[PDB]
Amino acid sequence: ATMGLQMVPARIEGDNIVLYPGTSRIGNNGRPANNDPMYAAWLPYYQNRIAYDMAEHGDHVRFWAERYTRGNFCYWRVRQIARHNQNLGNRPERGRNYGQHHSTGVI
RNA sequence: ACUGAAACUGUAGUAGAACCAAUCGGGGUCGUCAAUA
């Protein structure tokens, strides 16, 4: 279960697998370096739900995200999301803390 | 400036000899499963 920290989001694109670390950078061991955020955004899907403006696997999407904190780590919480053609709208304000998930306001 | 006639292409001969539809295989048995937050 510790091995999941060492995995980067990836997409194959032709004969290449292309890594997508996002705003964070791949540390030497493969974990997100120096406590920068998780390589993928978290799309709240079940316990809190962010429908478009429900997204499915492999939807190309454009979205706002907010850096949120829990425990030793932080991540980009998807705040609102649109299909890549649509417009995601104006910058959202400070998100609500969702239990132990605390907003940083970096959006 | 006188049509020849009459005559069974029949008679004898086994599409057959040899070749395995076969070779191997206990109707058997134990460790999880799942990936997030």
Side-chain angles (χ1 to χ4, degrees):
Chain A
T2 53
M3 204 176 93
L5 306 178
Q6 285 78 248
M7 308 195 191
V8 71
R11 194 173 172 237
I12 112 170
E13 298 185 5
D15 66 358
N16 273 243
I17 179 81
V18 45
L19 314 183
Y20 286 115
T23 316
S24 38
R25 46 273 195 292
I26 306 161
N28 190 2
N29 287 292
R31 293 189 287 278
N34 56 71
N35 208 249
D36 70 3
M38 300 297 94
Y39 303 127
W42 294 17
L43 171 62
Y45 211 97
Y46 300 116
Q47 184 59 86
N48 302 277
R49 186 186 293 270
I50 302 296
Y52 288 131
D53 185 26
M54 202 73 203
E56 254 300 334
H57 180 62
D59 290 348
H60 189 179
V61 291
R62 185 179 171 202
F63 60 97
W64 286 107
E66 179 169 355
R67 193 168 178 175
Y68 264 73
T69 300
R70 183 173 185 173
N72 291 309
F73 77 99
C74 64
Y75 66 96
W76 293 101
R77 195 164 189 68
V78 178
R79 291 299 307 288
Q80 62 197 52
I81 184 157
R83 193 73 208 233
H84 63 292
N85 311 110
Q86 282 62 30
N87 296 293
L88 77 172
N90 296 301
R91 183 181 179 82
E93 305 306 334
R94 289 300 306 258
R96 170 60 194 251
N97 297 339
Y98 289 101
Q100 209 178 25
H101 293 317
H102 305 298
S103 155
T104 66
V106 184
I107 291 169

